[PDB]
Structure formats: structure tokens, C-alpha cells
Write a protein that binds this DNA or RNA. Sequence first.
RNA 1: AUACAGUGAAACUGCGAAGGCUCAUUAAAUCAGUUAUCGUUUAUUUGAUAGUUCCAUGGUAUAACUGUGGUAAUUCUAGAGCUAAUACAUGCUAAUCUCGACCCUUUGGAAGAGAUGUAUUUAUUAGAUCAAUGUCUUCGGACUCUUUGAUGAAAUAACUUUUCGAAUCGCAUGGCCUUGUGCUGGCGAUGGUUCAUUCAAAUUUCUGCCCUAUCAACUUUCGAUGGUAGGAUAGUGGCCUACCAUGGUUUCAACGGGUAACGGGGAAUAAGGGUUCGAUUCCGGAGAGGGAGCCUGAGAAACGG
Lengths: 591, 134, 37, 229, 123, 166, 37
Amino acid sequence: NGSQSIKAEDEKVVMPYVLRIFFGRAQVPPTSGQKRSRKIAVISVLPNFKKPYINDFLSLASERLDYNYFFGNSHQINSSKATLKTIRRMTGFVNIVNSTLSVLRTNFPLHTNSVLQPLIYSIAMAYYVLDTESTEEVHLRKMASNLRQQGLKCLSSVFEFVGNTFDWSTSMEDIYAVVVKPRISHFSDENLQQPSSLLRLFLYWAHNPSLYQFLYYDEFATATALMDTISNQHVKEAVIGPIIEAADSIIRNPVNDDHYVDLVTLICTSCLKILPSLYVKLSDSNSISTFLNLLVSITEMGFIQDDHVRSRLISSLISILKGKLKKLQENDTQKILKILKLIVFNYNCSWSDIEELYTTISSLFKTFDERNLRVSLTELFIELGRKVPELESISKLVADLNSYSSSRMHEYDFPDFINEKPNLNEASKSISMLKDILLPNIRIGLRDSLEEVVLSYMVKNTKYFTDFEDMAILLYNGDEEADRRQRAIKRLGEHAHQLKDNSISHYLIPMIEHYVFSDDERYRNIGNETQIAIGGLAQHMSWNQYKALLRRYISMLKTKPNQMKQAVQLITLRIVRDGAESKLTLSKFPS
Amino acid sequence: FEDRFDAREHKDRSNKSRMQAMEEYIRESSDQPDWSASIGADIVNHGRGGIKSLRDTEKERRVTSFEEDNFTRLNITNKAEKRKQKQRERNARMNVIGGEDFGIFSSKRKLEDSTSRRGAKKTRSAWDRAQRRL
Amino acid sequence: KGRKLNYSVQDPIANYEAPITSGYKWSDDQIDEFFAG
Amino acid sequence: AAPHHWLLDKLSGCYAPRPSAGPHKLRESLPLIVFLRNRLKYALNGREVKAILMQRHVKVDGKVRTDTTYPAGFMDVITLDATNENFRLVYDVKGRFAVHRITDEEASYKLGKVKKVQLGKKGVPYVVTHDGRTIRYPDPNIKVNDTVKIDLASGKITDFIKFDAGKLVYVTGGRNLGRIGTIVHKERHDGGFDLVHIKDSLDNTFVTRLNNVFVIGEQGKPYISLPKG
Amino acid sequence: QSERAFQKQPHIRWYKNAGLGFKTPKTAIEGSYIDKKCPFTGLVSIRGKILTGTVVSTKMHRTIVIRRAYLHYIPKYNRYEKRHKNVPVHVSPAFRVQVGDIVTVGQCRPISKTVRFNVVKVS
Amino acid sequence: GISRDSRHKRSATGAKRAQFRKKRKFELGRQPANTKIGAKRIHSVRTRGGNKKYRALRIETGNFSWASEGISKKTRIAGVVYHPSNNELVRTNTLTKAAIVQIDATPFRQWFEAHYGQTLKIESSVESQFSAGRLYACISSRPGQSGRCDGYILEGEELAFYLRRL
Amino acid sequence: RLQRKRHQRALKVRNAQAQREAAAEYAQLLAKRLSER
RNA sequence: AUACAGUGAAACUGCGAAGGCUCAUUAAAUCAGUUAUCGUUUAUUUGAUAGUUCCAUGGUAUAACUGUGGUAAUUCUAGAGCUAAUACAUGCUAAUCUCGACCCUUUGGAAGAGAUGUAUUUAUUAGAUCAAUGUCUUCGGACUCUUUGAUGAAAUAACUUUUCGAAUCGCAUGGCCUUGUGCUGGCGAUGGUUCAUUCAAAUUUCUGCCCUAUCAACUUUCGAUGGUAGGAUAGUGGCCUACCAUGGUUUCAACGGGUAACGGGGAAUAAGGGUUCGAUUCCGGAGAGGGAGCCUGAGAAACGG
């Protein structure tokens, strides 16, 4: 008969709204008691009478789900629903602790709340009943103790009711009457917030606009309290950033920066949070990261600091200038952030950024020589913008070489901090050399020569565009250096980049021989570069299977010579992974 | 191609090559005795049959061993007895003279073809025959 | 067009029925002076 | 009318006992009548082996299973209550069913080759063996042709033997049926003559199939005891 | 690539893998070809054995006629008379096989009256 | 039907002299039950033990599926206009699998007006049938084997995929 | 009759308290294998 | 033993028969092994395997049986009267599962929110990451490209004339005091849905002893060869039909010619001297007067309709 009544519900829509409201009115007239319970509360209730009431709430749920647009709603059905919900609350909170009929009437009450939320799920902007405050005060006096009750990952009876009441136009009258956002914000600022906290945050972010478009001054102060909740909930959207739904945070922070500027410490906290929005997770997308940096700039245009947020915005621009993502949109937002950071370093940054980012002109090569002849003492964002131009951004090749040489000149004129800046230059040149670049690899080689300012002739002859006598002199220089972990790793990386699967050129056997000779000359340095030799042999072993295995086989055979010389010298090690790699070679032998 | 379980090649045959002249020479040069009966006990029907041949007393010993071993008398199964007992006793009185069967001397069956002249150790190399001697 | 329209002669239907001589109770002259037009 | 595996003497009868259906196949099993009556000879005829089956002395795989033609296949531990008879029967080197005598701590378990692992219904991992013990929930690293160890009091897998290069394997099938020694070679082809190869006294070589071979332990330590000569 | 009615589509663009040492080309993973009976996306599953040989004719579409000459140790007239075999095979979106072209096939699920093999490799 | 065996016909080599055998039970071809529109009558035939097979002949209540949301709802049948597995099958107006048949789409109107409010993002050449009432939909289920008429609606790409045909 | 109504209900609730608890009792062993894997 | 109580003609029941003769001549297509079926049926064997409840027990209609009879007559019959079910078919049925605001510290979970199947046939998708023994140590960390591992490349929207949530029994008075069968309460066989195995069958990969070119062409003349879709199927399948393409086999032996094909092929046992006698499965498929159509079953175009 459940399947039969489900068929009756699936065919219970064929009659008009008059007959649907008449059948709903007959369903309401079972145990309404509007003479007894339309004033305040009910007169009496029973277990089987609540079972008629639980069945009435279930029939209301089935009728609303069947006719989930119109539902034939009536104030008699509303009064019967309020009488049933109040009788469920009264019986559950007035019965003794025996829990059988109490849990029956509690699962009657949760299902009746689900059927009540179904009415607003079906007929939301259709009725908008003007006597809402009766049921609103009834449900408030029932669920006053539901302060932090709806704070969970699945608690969505009163949380969904609050979201429905907040996502309307004029049904927020019961919200702005006394309180909805107070208890919602209490459970939102609860510290054990699960991932419905983002749902409540998006609901309040969408519901601040109705409280702002409302002409009532009470709703204006409630919108002020929603901005105050956005300022007092400065840990929830931080700690709940476990998914890629950071567009809600970027949509609230832009709304907050466009709406309310209430404290300089609040603007500094917003700028530091949007700095953590780019220094917290690397999976933030382009529009979200651009709007987050623009919201940090919008808080900085109002109430920024002069030293602390100055350095924070300078670090933000020093990351965003190395990024420059999304076809110069992030570069334009980074130029705006550097012009809003309000320092002397930021002033030189905005000058040397606007003088180069003038919409694809020769002003980039003009401004590189301009700041070279007029070298600025900030130099951090200058080295960022001149190392993005030294990377695989095609123009400013000689200007990139002059920028690296001028950074070396400043690092020699310092004579400590600018040597740690040269450490960052070397840690950038390492990832530049281990890459598929052509102009930026030559620029990193020029930076290696400027850091080297026999060895200088070796570097300039490795970057000589000749490659036959040049590679012969490189092999002879490796022989002279044989007769350095990261340094020889960088040299062998540049050599492997110049002979990296370029099988349209000859002497690849001597090129791999020079790679293995530099690897042997690094592996002779056992006290330092044994780890680097192990890493280079490991990367060559990964390349021995990664889609190409002709010259990598001879690289494996000639990197075995370091092991042969080490075993002849030993005449303790790690035999285990060596034997397992021997088993892997035996498996590659059965290919 | 592929393997196929062959009981006819891991079954104990040992009878294609069992020749009575070779077996008699082995019994002569055996240097361990032969379990012969007390002399009257092996004649059969008061002399109406033969004595009994060596294969017949071997088969009789096997039948009595199986007999005592699983407690069952053998039977008078008609088709097998009308073949084997009558044909066996008629060739017994044909060829068994005084407890000795002379049927083989009247039978064409080459000794060296099947039972001598080893097939696995054929030694078809001068080096293999040299290593087989030394 | 393989099995489609085999113009062959088939065995059991070659004498399945038998004709009739007079046939139509009308005359062929009655056909001609029936649908001249 | 007999197979080769039963070690059945020819001077027995005319009709050979077809085993009934059961765990193993017809071609890889011996029933209880050919086990008890005419191999280790606890009976003399079918009447009295049915009599002791009605008396229920047999306790194969820890359950009684009173039936004459019950197909005891590979290493089903035949247990007999009187004189505490524990019999694990394996293959010899020439194709028959060598029934080794074992003790109680060894007959408290058996082992079984896994045939397939399934996501059958309702998220339940799943394992079958040659007696078809559909036991719940092994680890995800049960490949085909590994070896579970059944509990034989409940049904649970207690130990697990992984099939890889360097494991002690038993071959039941084809022209290698019943050999042990498991190491000269490994060769996994792509559809046939794919195996791990088995030594001899002079360490000779052999070819078989994957499904016709299954692991029993390690190089020197199988927890099955084996007969000798 | 739609010359017939009745919603020419994969049957649940779609992509799978039979495994067992046979690659799937990138157009056969993500391409506009339907792969109704090509086993990489397909509806069929792989099993059985894998046979290898050159071809004779690829005249009709979805018909790859393999040749397969193989050695057999003849003891009768003690000389090897040379083998020849034929098998029709459905297409794959990986190689337009012309004359020559030693290729291999795997046994699966009889497609026409005489085809159980579908191409998985070209070399 | 008759058969399922290669013995009555020629192979890929061209053989003759067939004269093979009395046909067995397991070559069982039943009669082709061309399912039509009528009053719902399903013949419950037996095969292979208790394998009851539902052979539908006059089925109506097609469960056809809204595609973009996957809403299989109940409707009637009108007629198939194009099905060249037999071009006389659409002349005789039967109902087989993979046929494109017409549906009075009034419960789909009810579901759209029930879970969207207003009446009429969806394509225009099916919005015309949203207005008129008869929409094209293709049968998925097998009434000759499973006895049911299920199907999927035509929505856009598949619509034009058939409308350019016929 | 009523004693059978006692025994039927008792064996039914005992069958539930055996089977529906043992099923989750080895599903938790699957959870242990998944945590250790 | 005044509602049953042992013998038991004739009736329902469970099963029995669980595999027997003759006739016309098929060249790996009859047969034997083998590969596979996530391409499929399965009684029995074996291992596993069920959560939707509004204002003390459900209905006549038939036997056997009596009684009246017909007919030459049957395991042929018809009226009239009763009467039972594991026959027919309507219908009676406690509250336990996770996340846990709070914890009072161990006797730890009270509030709130989310739960709950099968059988049939339809669609979207769950089905790239983090942990170090190490890159730099700045003896702190952004760590995966290197050195090794891991989750990982049935959840839901509907039909169906939908099956069920034990009217089976045995062993054990046993525990409790809800003040009386108030709760019985412990276990095992038979049930009972589904999966897998086993059995058997059907297809299917390949292999296997006559001479054959005076058989050099066959195949489209039961689709020839393949593709797409449907029908039918236990399912794969030109197995059948619509449409389309003109294919496919062959001198590396297609296709065709016959018998000591009452003989042969291991089809199998071999025998301690018989060297093609000498153990057997099968010659081919049919047939129950003759073709045709239908039915039954886990299995059939039934030796028994």
C-alpha cells in the first residue's frame, strides 16, 4: 500500500488548484484544532493522535513533493502544521525520559520541519504570508535552545530553514524582526565548524544584500551586523579552506572591501588574509586570485599601514610579479598593488613597472636600461621583474644579461643580504637551467658567467654557439677539473639541456660522454657531491624509462663507472636499493 | 604447441621388452636364489595339466597376494574365462613340456631389435661413445 | 537482389489448381460494350 | 573405465564409481569409496563403506559429509575419528593421489589457490578457491594464483602466500602434473605456456600453465609437511 | 562520421583499457571515432590467445584478412611444406593496414560469422 | 522463426552437400512478435528452466526519460515514422527497440511546471513540442524480450540527428 | 499456537541480532585491512 | 480411550521404469583432445548470503463418500447432497544505525542532524594527491623533480499488475518475578532471496594417417563476403529481415571423386614371444505406420502426450 499510495501521489495532480486545495483542506481537517491551538498552543495530544499528526506531516511532505510548485497551500494547512509542530515540541519536551514515544515524536518533529521547509522549497515567492510572525514566534519559542544545534556537516533542519529565510526578498521580515542572524552567527562562529560553515557564509553574503536594499533602518543595522560578522568571523573561511570553493571568500572580501571600511586593523587583517589567500594554497584559480589581490588592494586603498603592510604588499607584488598570470591581467593587478603599497620601494616599483608594462612597446627595453643607469636601492621587486624578463619571456635578452650583471654588481658593492639575494638568484638559475628554455637558458648561463666574474673562458665557450670545438674544450675543461654538488649538477644540467633528446645533431655520444665525465668528476667529490651523483644517476635512471632509452642506456652504463671506482676504492654502502634496481634492470632485460 | 597428460608415457610398461631368454640368463647370473616350491606343490590337476610355468606361478602368486590383500575371491566371469583359461591351457599343453615352455623357440620375435641395442644411450657421436666408455 | 524476384518454375504449384473454360458469365463482347467508356 | 590418478587395480570390477558433484571437478578428485575401500582398505565393499559412512567416521575439511561419491580433490584433509587419522592427500611425481599422513596442528588448516577477486555486489571484496570457499574480505593485494590458508574451524583466511618470482609452487595439470622444485626459470608469456619453471635432481627444466600450478610455500619452508621416500 | 541512423554513439568520449600489454592510441582514447567493436573502447572484452601474421587483402571495410605462415616439423615426407592461414578482423583507429604489415590480434566474442580476432598492434 | 545454426547455410569457403540433421530443441527460433499499440497484453513464455520471458505485443505505458535530467516518466505511444531495419515496419506502425516514436508530452509539461514554476534554456525545436505536445523519443527497452517499453527523449543533438534523416 | 508465536518472534529477533551484527563485525575487519593498507 | 488412536481391499499422495531394435552409406564438418564464455543456461553437490506500519487468527468451493441413473462398453459417464487442507486465495505483525556543541575524567555520552532492502527494465558519474631515511640545512620549513608507498585514473530520477521480513521441526524447564504461560529463553536441522563452485549442455580457438589437378576453379542459384540496426535467442553470431558495399577461398592444394568409411581413425585395455588375429567407445543420421503442428520438463523438437 506504500507503492499504491505512491502511485496515488504520482497521479494526485490531475485535478485543478481548487480540488487540490480542497483535498489538502480535508487533510488539514483531521486533527487541526484551530479553535484550541490557533491562539498559543494545543489543549491535548496522544501517541496515536501524534501518529495522525506525524502522518499529516508526511502527507504534507508527499503533497508538496508531488505538487512541488503550487502545492495548493492554505492558511488552514499552515495552522494545522503549526499546531502539529508545537504539539510535537510540547510532547517531546514535556514527556518523561522513556525515549520510545519521545523519539517517535522527535522523528515526527524533524519530518514535520522537513515538510515545513518543503513548502518554502516549493512555493517560496508565491504566497509570502503577511501573518508570518505568528508561526515565526511559535518556532522561535520552540527552538530558542537551538543556538549551536545546527552546527555540523549534516544538520540542515533549522540551518536550511535559516538559509531559506535569508535567501528571500520580503520573508526576511521575521529575520529582521528580532534575530535570525544572531543565532546563525553564534553557530557560525562556533569553533568546531564543519563544511556547512561555507554554506552559512555564502547565505549571509547573499543575505546582506537584501538587508542593504531594505529601506528599514533595523535591516540597515542588521547589514552592519552582517559586516561585523564578516569582521568577527576572520578565522572560519581561513580554517575551512579545504576545497576549491575560495570564490565565496573572494566574493565576500570584495563585497566587504566595497561595503565597509571600519578599522585600520581590520583592513590590515583583510590584507594579511588575502596575502595568505595567495600564500596558503597553490590551487587558487585566476579570477579568484585576481579578485583576492584586488580586494587586498581595495583594503589598502582605504586603511593600509606604512611599514608592516608595506612589506606584506611588497612580498605580494614580489610573488605576483614572478607570476604575471592570465595575459597581463595579474600583471596589471600587481602594478596596481605596487602603486597602492605606499612606500619608497613601492614608488620605484610602480615607476619601473609602468615604464615596462605599457601595452607591448619598446618601453620595456627602454626601462631596463633606464633603471640600469639609475639602479634603485629597493631591488627585490626589481629583481623579480627582471628575472621574469630573464625567464622565458622572449624580449630583453641583452637587457636580462645587463640586469643579472647589475644585480651581481650590487651584490659585490654590498660586501651578506645581497649575497643571500645571490643565493636566490642561483636557486632561480638552477630551475631555469633544468628546463626546456632556449633564451632563458642562455641568460642563466650568462648569469653563471657573471657569478664567475680558465673557468670564465670555459663558461663563455660553452655559450659560444659553436658546439664542436666548444664541446671539445668543454670535455678538456672537465678533464682539467677532474685531474661541487649543486654547481656540477647545474653544469651537467646545462649540458644535458644542450643535449636533451636533440636527435637531429651528431656527436651525441661525446655529449653524453661529457655529461658522464662531469658526473664522474662530481662523484669523485665523495664528501660533498656523493648525494648529487646519486641524484643525477637517479634522474638518468628515470629518463632511462621515460619514453626514450637510447642514449640513457649509455648514460646508465657510464654512470655505473662511479660505482666501479667506488667499489675499487672500497676494495659501507646501501646494497638493498642497488640490488632492487638490479632486479629492475633484469626486468627491463626481459623486455 | 602445448602439453597433454599422457599416462601411456608415464605408465610402467616393462613388458614390450621382457624376453624369456634374457630373463633366463639373468636368473642364471643373478647370484641370489629364486623361491622355488616344494616339488610336488606346483603340479596342477594330478598331472592332467602341466606342472605350471614360471609365468603362471608368478601370476598365481600375484592373484593370491591381491586375494589376501583385499579379502575377495575372484570369479568365473564368462567372457574373460572363455578367452583366457581355455586359450591359456591349450597353449600350455601345446608348448609347456615338463614345467618349461618351449613356445618361444617356435616364434619369430627379434631379440636385439626391441629388447637389446639401447635407444636412449645410442651414442651417435665418436665423442659421446668415447665418454661413455671413459 | 539475390532472393529478390527469382523468375524460376516451382514444383508443387505447377498443378496446384486447374482452369475453367467459360469462366466469366459475361461475354468478351459484353466486356467491350461494358467499358467502351 | 577408470582414470590414472586413483591408483586403481584393474582386477576390481566393471563399473567405475563416478564421483558426485561437489567442490572439485570430476577429473581432479577421488571419491570416498575409492579412497577408503580399495586404497587404504578400511572397507571390503560398498555396503560396509556405506555402513561406516552412516556411522560417520569421516570428517573431511572439518565437516562430516556422509556420502560415498564425495569428490575429495587436492589436499582436503580427510579426518577419521578412530585412531585420530589425519590424511592430507597430494599428488605424487607420476600422477596418482599420494595420501600423506599428517598430525592435528597441520590438519587444523588447509591452503587454496585464489582464482578470482570480485567487486560482486555491495562493495564486498571476494575470493574463491578450488573448493569454492567464498570467504569475506582479503587484502587488496590478492592477485590471481596466490595461496590463502583456510581456518577450518571458521572459514577465514589466516595466512597468505604471495605469488612471485622465488616461491615454492606445486603443479597439478598437464604433462608436469605433480612436480616440486619451483626454480630454474620464470617466464610469463601472454596467453599460454606461461609459468614458473621447476627443477629436478639434475635441475632440469619444465613448461606448464598458470592455472595448472599453485604455490605451497617458500624455498625450504613450506608449512605443509610432505611425504618422502 | 555518421552515415547511418539509430544514434551512432558509444553505448556506456568513452574509454577503457583491456590491459595485458597492448596500447590504446590517443585518438582511440579521446577521439570522434565510435569504437563499437574495436576492443580499446569497444563493447567486447579480451580473453583467449593472440595470433600474429601479415595480410593478404584489406578490400572491404572492417575486414582485415591476415595471413599466417608458421613452421611445423613434418615427419612424413621429412620436409616442411609451408603453412598458410586466413582470418578476417575488424578495423582499429591506429593503422590503415596495407599489403605486408605483420600485425597481431586477440581472441574475443564472435563478431561476424567468422571473426573472433581484432587488431591490437601494428609494428 | 526457424533456426540458429550455420549448418543450413554456407561458410566463408563455399561448401555444399549439407543434408545434415533433424533440428534440435536448442535451435529454437520463436515467432517474431511485432509489438504494437493496443491494450497491454504480455505473453509469459517459458525457456531454460523457470526463465519466464515477457513477450509484449500491445504495450502502451512507455517510461520515457528526460535526457538532461534523466527523468523517466510515464506516457503513451503514437507511431514510428522512420526505422530502416524494415521500411515497411513504419508503414505498419509497430513498436520495436531503437525506434523513434511520438509522445504526448503532457507529464513532462507537468514536471517542468512543477519543478520550475513557469511554463514555456532548452532547445527551440523541442520547445515547439513543449508548446504543442508531441515530442520525439526513441525506445531503449526490448518488448520482445523484457516485455517493457522504456525509452529516451530527443533533446537537441539527437533530435537534429534524426530530423535531418527523416 | 501462541507458544509458536513466542518461538517464531524470538528466533527472528535472534536471527537479526546474529546476522546483522556479524556482517558489520567483519566489515570492521575490512576497515582494519583498509587502514593498514 | 463416547472429537483421533491397530489389521487395512479401492482412491489422492512421494517416487519406480533413470535409457532398447532396425534401416539409407558422413572423409578432421562423424569423432577425440584443446582455447574461451565479464558470449550463456543450469535441478541436484559445495562455500557463502535479507531492515518502508493515521480513524488471540481471515472465505466459499470441490473431493473421497452417499444416493438416483444412462450405455453393448472402457481409468466412458451425468444430475442431487454433504465434507476437510502446508489444495485455492484475501489478509493480524518491537524500536536499532552514524556524525557526536556539551563532557569529567572514567561507570563518559546527553542534546541536535542524517537512517533504513530485494526482483524486473531506463541515465550522469564516485568508480590528481599526501608520508619520510634526502634537494637547502639557516640543525627551523614551501617540500615532490629526484629516494622509496598509498585512496586512486554502486551513489541516485522511474516503471513492473513484485517476491519476501518462517502458520516447519528437534534437543534442552533452563533463567528470570512486570504476580501469571508476565518476558519464555540457549542451540541445532528444514526453510528462505542472491552469488560463486560442481555437474551437464550449447557455441567457439586450434591440432589429429587414403590416393587424389582427368576435380582449377568455387562462392553470390536456404546471404555469397562484410558493415549498421532491429527480430529471435540461453546468450555471441547474416541465425533471419530492411538498407548499403562486391566481396571471400584457392597450385603454400579451394572445391569436388570412392571403397577391404560390416572398415577406419589411439577409441582403449593391454597380455613375460601371437608381431597389422589378439580389449572396447563410435560406422553417418534417423524411426516408433506416414510426413505436419503443438505440449511437458534442470535436460527433449520424448521409445512413455
